[PDB]
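Changelog note: in this version the structure field was regenerated for every chain. One regenerated record is shown below for reference.
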Amino acid sequence: QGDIVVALYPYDGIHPDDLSFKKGEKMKVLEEHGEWWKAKSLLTKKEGFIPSNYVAKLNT
């Protein structure tokens, strides 16, 4: 269905598919792969891979 998560910690695309997100930023996951999923930035609509320990549901 697609879950919405908010960047809890800034991420600078260090990988080829890792999507970069900045704390306070919101992201949506289009697919879950266990501990890793691919989300997209509502700001630049960019999509990449995000860890399940840097982003979460809501926050501030």
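Spot check on this record: DSSP finds no helices and five strands in the chain. The first strand starts at residue 3 and ends at 7.
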